[PDB]
Symmetry: C5
């Protein structure tokens, strides 16, 4: 990914610190690997707080990465939180015509979330995937706009 | 320690299951007071359905809003459609108004679950406190972001 | 509740008249007991039709009450109607900054809906609850905005 | 019981029917058309689309220049989750349009688990229900109601 | 019996699960070509989540857009929120821009199910072709409705 021009925002929640930090770390790695060593990084408490800050960043950034973890608890809370946050991320991308890379984990168990958080032992790095998605899409959009 | 003395906070709390709602509200006030806000705008409504229009009304004139209430599953699918609509209303408003909305609306299957989350002396969790900490920390973050432009 | 100064709209479906008529009657009684003797009352056939009428009422009233019933049938239709209507009522309340009391029942059985329609044998009066909801919240907003 | 019909002769009506599962779609359209004629509208604007996913955008086009729109079609659950997401988004979409355009949208989009359920709701000679008829009634009655309110 | 020669067609296709994505795109291309459109605008993105923002970009300057891709259920609820939110986004865009968006985003439980709907030699269905047909035929309908 050659992403040197671009302004990247990263919004990462903090609930389940270890997972969130590792999501952040993976997002940062891909950004750095793509020419962006200093993305705008912001932290929030939980996933619920992510949309409003992703919105704030999207208005002044070419791309934003949304990072966090929701693990199902005892109640239906999980279902309404995951649906609303994910749909909020879709809205902001459309409203602002800016890609929002979705690295917000929605898992039934902790081990699932750990297995996707880009730790040494993880099957996947969702932080990295979200960053690649945000950046690659922003480049494509910049290419489309720079025509006619 | 959150220092929010500069900020205007609205709190809307439903009244359906008053023991729980009152405890959610008490947990929110405490965080606010502990954060330097002794006098937030507090408004009561009947049930969860009523919360969003008032959250909007408050979000327009406040830096942060906390939405508190409880919906407990009964016999019918009513639970599902209320929880989903209210929750998405709270998301819509925060985005429309670029104002954090702390979600302390409990959506439980049983009453014991709600009580266990209401920040009563016996409760596992204090959802009103978490929803106030969420809203205030987010508003200070937004404030910081906007002071850079 | 003193709501004398407030303009109130009520939209009630007519599908399943035992249920719908009883919901409307419970809402009317709250409105009357709150000092609103002449609310704008509008009937529609089914629940799907309630949103566009609620929207129309909300634009010229201080509160609106939505009443009807969706009972689950054989197909997923129930799920998509209840969700879409319910979310529509939320949209309208927000768009118009006017409360919309939700008295649209969404039940699995007809017996559940009867038991919520505020007939003399009913455990609950959801028309009454929807009306108190809309009117108390309207007074609250009035107060806030003053 | 005999009850006089809706008089909607002063109204402009649009009808959009999809085509997937065409004998069912055609039957919905015919039931809707019957009710429109009975109500005084022999020439509604009738438009056909491929599937239910195509219904919203056309319903919107019609809603801008008509007093009522009828939305007709069929989704039958298949193998995959596609049914759920399609049904939800289409139904949501019809709700959004009615609000955006303050114009009623009569919902005759069947969303069934089986073909037999759809057939039984499509107003065929042998059908239990005529959801096309129902959807046309809803849109037209609601439209007259709105006109009545707007005179106030 | 689709004559869209005079129409502007945009196609967005994700990349995740290449074989299927590529076949979906070949299916839509073939339909466009047969309908008189030999140079559609074709954009590639990483995954389903990235489809709507690009579909929006194209819908603003095209008479029709085709959205193509595949989401296959894995271990967590991620599938349900991505599917609901993408499908809802495509519906939103079509309405916002009054421009048809053909939906060729597969949402499946299994890989075999996706492969069976991707328009491969032995596939039961050609969802790319179906999405292109949908978008183009609806585009013509709107053109007629607007004509006088
Ligand atoms: Na931007
Ligand atoms: Na504000
Ligand atoms: Na009003
Ligand atoms: Na109209
Ligand atoms: Na366009």
């Amino acid at each position: 990914i050659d992403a040197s021009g671009l302004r990247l925002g990263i919004v990462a929640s903090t609930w389940h610190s270890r997972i969130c930090d590792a999501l952040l770390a993976g997002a940062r790695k891909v950004a750095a690997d793509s020419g962006i060593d200093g993305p705008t990084v912001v932290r929030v408490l939980g996933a619920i707080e992510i949309p409003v800050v992703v919105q704030e960043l999207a208005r002044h950034h070419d791309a934003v990465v949304a990072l966090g973890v929701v693990i199902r608890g005892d109640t239906p809370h999980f279902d309404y939180v995951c649906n609303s946050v994910t749909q909020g991320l879709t809205r902001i991308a459309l409203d602002t015509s800016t890609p929002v890379g979705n690295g917000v984990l929605t898992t039934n168990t902790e081990k699932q979330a750990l297995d996707r958080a880009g730790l040494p032992t993880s099957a996947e790095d969702k932080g990295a995937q979200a960053a690649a998605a945000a950046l690659t899409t922003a480049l494509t959009l910049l290419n489309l706009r720079s025509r006619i």
